[PDB]
Amino acid sequence: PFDLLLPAAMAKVAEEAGVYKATKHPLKTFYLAITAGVFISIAFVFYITATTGTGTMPFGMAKLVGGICFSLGLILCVVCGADLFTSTVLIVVAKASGRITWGQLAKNWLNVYFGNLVGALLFVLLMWLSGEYMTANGQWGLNVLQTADHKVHHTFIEAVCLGILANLMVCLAVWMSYSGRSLMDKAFIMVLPVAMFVASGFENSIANMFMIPMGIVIRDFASPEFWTAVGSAPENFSHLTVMNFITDNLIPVTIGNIIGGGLLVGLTYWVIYLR
Amino acid sequence: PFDLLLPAAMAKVAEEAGVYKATKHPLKTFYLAITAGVFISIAFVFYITATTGTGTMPFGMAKLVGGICFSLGLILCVVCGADLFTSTVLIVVAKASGRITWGQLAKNWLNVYFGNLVGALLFVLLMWLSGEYMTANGQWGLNVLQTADHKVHHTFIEAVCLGILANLMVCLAVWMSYSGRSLMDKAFIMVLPVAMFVASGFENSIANMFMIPMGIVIRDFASPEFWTAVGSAPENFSHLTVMNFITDNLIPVTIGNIIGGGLLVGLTYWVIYLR
Amino acid sequence: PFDLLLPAAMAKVAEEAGVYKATKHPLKTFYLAITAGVFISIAFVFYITATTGTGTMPFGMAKLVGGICFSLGLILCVVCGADLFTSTVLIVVAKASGRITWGQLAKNWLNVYFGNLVGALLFVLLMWLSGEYMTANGQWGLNVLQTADHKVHHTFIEAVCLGILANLMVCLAVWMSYSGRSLMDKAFIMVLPVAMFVASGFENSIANMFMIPMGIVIRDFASPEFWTAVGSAPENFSHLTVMNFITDNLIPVTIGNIIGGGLLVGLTYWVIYLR
Amino acid sequence: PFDLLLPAAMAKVAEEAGVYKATKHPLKTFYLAITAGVFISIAFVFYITATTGTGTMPFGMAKLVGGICFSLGLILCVVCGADLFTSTVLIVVAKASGRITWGQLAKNWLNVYFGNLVGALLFVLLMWLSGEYMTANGQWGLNVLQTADHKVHHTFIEAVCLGILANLMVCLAVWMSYSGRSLMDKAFIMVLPVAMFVASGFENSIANMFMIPMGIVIRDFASPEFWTAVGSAPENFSHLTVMNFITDNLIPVTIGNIIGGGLLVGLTYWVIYLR
Amino acid sequence: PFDLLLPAAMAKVAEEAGVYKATKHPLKTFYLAITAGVFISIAFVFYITATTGTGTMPFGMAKLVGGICFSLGLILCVVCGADLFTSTVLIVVAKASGRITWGQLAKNWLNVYFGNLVGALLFVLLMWLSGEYMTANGQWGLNVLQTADHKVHHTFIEAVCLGILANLMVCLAVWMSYSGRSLMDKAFIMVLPVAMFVASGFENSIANMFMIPMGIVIRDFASPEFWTAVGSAPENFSHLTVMNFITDNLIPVTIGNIIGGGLLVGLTYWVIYLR
């Protein structure tokens, strides 16, 4: 009563949440994953808006403010009960406890991944129809294009490790929020961990599902006035391809996400406490 | 007790609030809508004051600070119980639940819209009688004029999508505040979502009801000293017309507001939880 | 229990506080008004200290930081139970409810006004005896002089409307703090509304009771070294006169304060809820 | 329960705390005063570290950040139960109530003053042995020397009034923290009042007990490399003398501290409420 | 209930936590120490990311932001129940109380130290495999190298005193967090004390266990493109050697850590309260 949960109780509520999320109806899970993807896309839009025009600003300060803005998406995911893949990886605790089977875990992960992708694509369509890429004389679109272009230029091991580091922070934020008992203890304990992985540049698969397709759409369908304003051409971002997106980024970053989240946070604390 | 509300309880308190707001007396609803319009105009005044003179400042940082300042209006609307149209669209949850009829919804929406417009006009009159447009050697009035001029230059589909995105954030902030149990959990969970839509540039109909008429009034009745100080002439803002305001902005942004708020937040969560 | 007060309960605690404040002993009211004036003078000293040297800083950011600093005075007034005139105007709710008479209201308002003036003068004497006007090579005194000089150059209608807007924000902050149940919900819900009216430039009579006499004292009794450092002369601020202070500022700003506070916040919510 | 304390209860808990602190064992009081002096020295070290290199930064912003950093010391003093002289002056409430005698008050004040001085000297020794004065190519030591040099150049009446203003803010912060019921309401209500007196330049005797001896030690025992880096010589700070420290600063600032704290905060509220 | 713990209760919960941590199973202690080292490495990564490119920024502001970012690691250690050596030194309270023996204390300290080192090395390997040292055209790696190089250039007495000061702040933050009763009172009371020791430059042994080996790895295995971008050569950091790391830094900083933490915080408060 009125007290923060101790780590053992944190692990037991994590186990219970894993069982609850794994036993939910597939259609409800799909809808919640769509909302989670929409929230993550909202967070990346805030990040891009905040970090626009900060070239003269110091690198660390601008990235820190961008991460503080980006934490809104995962705060929304936690508060609104949406199913985010980075958070659904933590059902490995319930899997190890034996309360859920491997088939339930596989179905939940697939459903949440697909729903997150659908939500990210829907928000990409909305963002493009809004005309946001011409903000600040095209600097918003240029920021989107540069952010997307940088993510497609990583090695397999580098992408895997970046995904491990990103899902480490996301699952640590979720685990810490498990201790909170109010809307504020479950939101303010989650700004710094997310801001770390956003400012550092760690790669999140769900966030990339919004980022890279947005960059591809802007590279393809931008008006010539946008290119004239930004002083660049589409051939400067030729590497922004769907196949390159899925191959150079999606698979390695996703594999790193599983390895980080449900091996370095879920399983380790299950071993420490719930074994 | 002492715990944040779970999403199912959040949806049920949203339904109950919708029924309560739809069954209120029309005169009380009109007065509360007037207060809500006054609060929204207060928020836009804070935004304009904060963002004045930030041309040299980075775009994202200045817009983020402006949004943080702007969140005060919706915080006031939630705390003081005022009826804001962006929030009254969420009575579609109670409509879908069957607790209220279509006539009640239509009457509530019309009354709240009219009251918000009346409150915005009253605060426009107060702001003009205050002489605030000559602050910082006319940079306050110039900021108001530029903000109003930019909003009148959007396509129908772009305005509709911008309104969808704005009401998405507003209704998401309201839905998240439904989880809080104190004045602080119902205020700090609402700064970031509002700051997102303010910094990004998403269009809110109620906020525009204060913004654009203020710009028209300043364009019409400004002293020649103000124009000399700002180095511009009224013909530079010829497009700032009442008919252009209602046609290019009000109808599309309002339609986008309904489509965002009571289709992408209210109905989706009613389907997920209250069906 | 553990929950924020609903607007009806907020209005009833406002009514009860009005009755309690109107029925207090006159000497206790005088002492509390003196403490309130001291707190308001403390807030203006923080504002001046924070905004010193921010000429190169953007206008909005500097004024926002100054308002955040200024909110300390009204936070102190609320927490410590001091009687501030901007807050005592809200006893019009209890007057309309019939719990107090017109004579009690008049006596309370006069006593609180006189006590606030006495406290502001005492803090002016303390500030002058401290030697603070020579801070930053006289930039503190120059900031005080410019702030005082700008306030004496407003029309009657402009001053009345500025006072209306200022007391609107002050009474709205008090009304919102009525909802809070802890020291933090009653302090953080009060920073933004005060910061708005401070950054915008709205005129508060009690704050001006410290500001303008301080400027007059500095204009009169400053050392020639201060004038040499600031590169100005007393004849540059000839308009800073006590008669000009009371006539151009005190009466119109005070009348606007009553019209804002106990007509646009107190009476409107009494009509909505307590009628 | 769950509610902030009303001013009458705040005064009664202040009286009870005064009796408790006055009736404590002298050795425990001495140890707690040593810890309080260490905490105050920690706060001044944070202030110096934060304000180092901020010459190009605006005066008010840099001093505000320095005060926010400095509030940590008094937050530590309140949370950890240390006996700080600025806080022990408030036992005048219990003295006026008759619960403690004059001898107890005198012994408590002397013991706390001596313990604070001993703790400040111990932290001065630790800071010198750490080698911190060579941080940022000697700018840390130069900041310490300038801060110490400015404090030794005040008139008796100016020093007395500055001490009155400083202890006013410190005792007001303590009195406001008496209302809080958790670690957060007793810490966040204390940042702004302390930041005011730090940013403004009001003189605290305990803080000066760390500041000035540190400056004397740096002036005496600095390496010639430090002087070469800072581009100055010890003769530029000849006035930094122990006798000048105790005569020009310690006695007047301390007398102002008593007059502020236990006449303008303690006795006034005892008269208002506890008489 | 709902109230912050008084200092006597703070000391008794510190004693109980010491007994609990000293009586835990060695393998669980090792795993928790590994997680604590990972969290500390995460905090140093945030610090490096935040402070990258802030050469033009004022020294104090940049170091303050870096410390605010760095506080995340110790917040994670407290919330997640990890065993950090700087925190395990406080079991000297339980040792003095007689509840645990000297052998238990020695075994706990050795196990926690070894686990922290293993976790720091694992995160060093992950950081190197991520490729983070090429961020901002090698400015991230240059910041890491400079931070590591500066720490290897301290005298024995200076390193001992810096460790004393660092563990003072860490143990004071832990002791203050013992008073909090929620996730927020146990996190926000811990940002300022950690930020102090990070901004000032006080040396923490566990943090150095991540910092210096990372610098050695970057100095050894960096690509020539990184050196070309940063405009430097490995011979500029020849002193970055493992033997120099353990001799010039590890032993003196660790000894200072024990002397600070479990003599100046644990034993002093045991003497004041628990004797």
Side-chain angles (χ1 to χ4, degrees), chain A residues 78 177-190, chain B residues 4:
Chain A
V78 161
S177 94
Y178 281 148
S179 179
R181 312 257 308 231
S182 152
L183 206 58
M184 183 176 282
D185 322 86
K186 284 210 203 268
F188 260 24
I189 207 78
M190 291 182 61
Chain B
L4 85 169

Side-chain angles (χ1 to χ4, degrees), chain D residues 22-93:
Chain D
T23 55
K24 248 167 23 215
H25 193 265
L27 256 194
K28 182 169 184 248
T29 295
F30 187 62
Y31 297 146
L32 286 172
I34 292 188
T35 77
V38 169
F39 297 159
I40 283 311
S41 305
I42 283 178
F44 227 132
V45 164
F46 206 178
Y47 170 74
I48 294 300
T49 292
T51 51
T52 281
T54 70
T56 62
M57 211 195 164
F59 193 89
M61 302 295 122
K63 302 268 148 132
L64 177 56
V65 184
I68 292 150
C69 298
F70 194 93
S71 37
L72 170 62
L74 183 66
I75 288 167
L76 264 162
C77 290
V78 161
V79 173
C80 288
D83 300 347
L84 195 60
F85 181 65
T86 79
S87 295
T88 64
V89 175
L90 279 176
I91 69 173
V92 81
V93 184

Side-chain angles (χ1 to χ4, degrees), chain C residues 2 28 32 39 42 46 49-50 52 65 69 72 76 79-80 123 129-130 132 181-184 186 188, chain D residues 2-4 60-61 64 158 161 165 169 172 176 179-180 184-185 188 192-193 196 199-200 202 269 272-273:
Chain C
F2 304 94
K28 182 169 184 248
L32 286 172
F39 297 159
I42 283 178
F46 206 178
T49 292
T52 281
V65 184
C69 298
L72 170 62
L76 264 162
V79 173
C80 288
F123 210 77
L129 289 173
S130 64
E132 256 279 27
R181 312 257 308 231
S182 152
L183 206 58
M184 183 176 282
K186 284 210 203 268
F188 260 24
Chain D
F2 304 94
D3 279 40
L4 85 169
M61 302 295 122
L64 177 56
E158 292 177 350
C161 299
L165 297 155
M169 311 303 335
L172 275 169
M176 260 195 303
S179 179
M184 183 176 282
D185 322 86
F188 260 24
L192 251 54
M196 212 282 263
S200 305
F202 307 153
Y269 280 142
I272 292 172
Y273 297 103

Side-chain angles (χ1 to χ4, degrees), chain C residues 12 15-16 19 23 93-101 104:
Chain C
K12 293 179 179 179
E15 185 205 60
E16 289 307 310
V19 187
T23 55
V93 184
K95 178 48 218 152
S97 316
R99 328 258 317 260
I100 85 157
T101 59
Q104 297 198 344

Side-chain angles (χ1 to χ4, degrees), chain E residues 122-193:
Chain E
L122 154 57
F123 210 77
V124 164
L125 179 56
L126 213 48
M127 284 321 296
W128 184 250
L129 289 173
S130 64
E132 256 279 27
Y133 80 106
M134 275 288 237
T135 316
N137 229 53
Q139 293 311 297
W140 201 96
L142 193 61
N143 201 5
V144 155
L145 276 151
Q146 286 174 333
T147 303
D149 191 52
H150 154 51
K151 296 181 156 332
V152 86
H153 287 322
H154 284 127
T155 319
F156 196 89
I157 67 132
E158 292 177 350
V160 160
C161 299
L162 282 173
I164 289 165
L165 297 155
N167 214 21
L168 198 62
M169 311 303 335
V170 183
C171 288
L172 275 169
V174 170
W175 207 272
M176 260 195 303
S177 94
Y178 281 148
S179 179
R181 312 257 308 231
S182 152
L183 206 58
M184 183 176 282
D185 322 86
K186 284 210 203 268
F188 260 24
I189 207 78
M190 291 182 61
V191 185
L192 251 54

